[PDB]
Amino acid sequence: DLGKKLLEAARAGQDDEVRILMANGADVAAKDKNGSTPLHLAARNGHLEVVKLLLEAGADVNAQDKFGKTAFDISIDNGNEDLAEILQ
Ligand SMILES: [Co+2]
Ligand SMILES: [Co+2]
């Protein structure tokens, strides 16, 4: 499903796939097995470019995963200053 593919594209940092999937109706609110949204996976793997695309596409920046973490929280845990800046 488009959801699963979008979650994978975000996780992998494949913005080319994220653009196509979104343009094809992919749900930016999708969640994987741990309640992680595309925003969370892109953030966890530090794909700042995909994080920006998802935000511009309307992604809920405050979505919380199974551990109650937002993408910002993850970026802070990971010490990714560049990411935290975009998500602050
Ligand atoms: Co790319
Ligand atoms: Co990347």
Q: What is the number of the ligand closest to the CA of 41?
A: 2
CATH number given to 1-88: 1.25.40.20
Tell me how far apart the alpha carbons of residues 80 and 56 are, in angstroms, rounded to a whole number: 20
Closest among 41, 16, 18, 38 to 29, alpha carbons compared? 38
> What's the CA-to-centroid distance between 8 and ligand 1, angstroms?
14
SS3 72: helix
| Domains in the chain: boundaries | 1-88
In what helix (H) or strand (E) does residue 81 lie, and over which residues does it extend?
A: helix 81-87
Tell me how far apart the alpha carbons of residues 81 and 75 are, in angstroms, rounded to a whole number: 7
Closest among 74, 46, 42 to 56, alpha carbons compared? 42
The answer to whether 66 and 41 have CB atoms below 8 angstroms apart is no
> What's the CA-to-centroid distance between 64 and ligand 1, angstroms?
26
Q: How was this structure determined?
A: X-ray
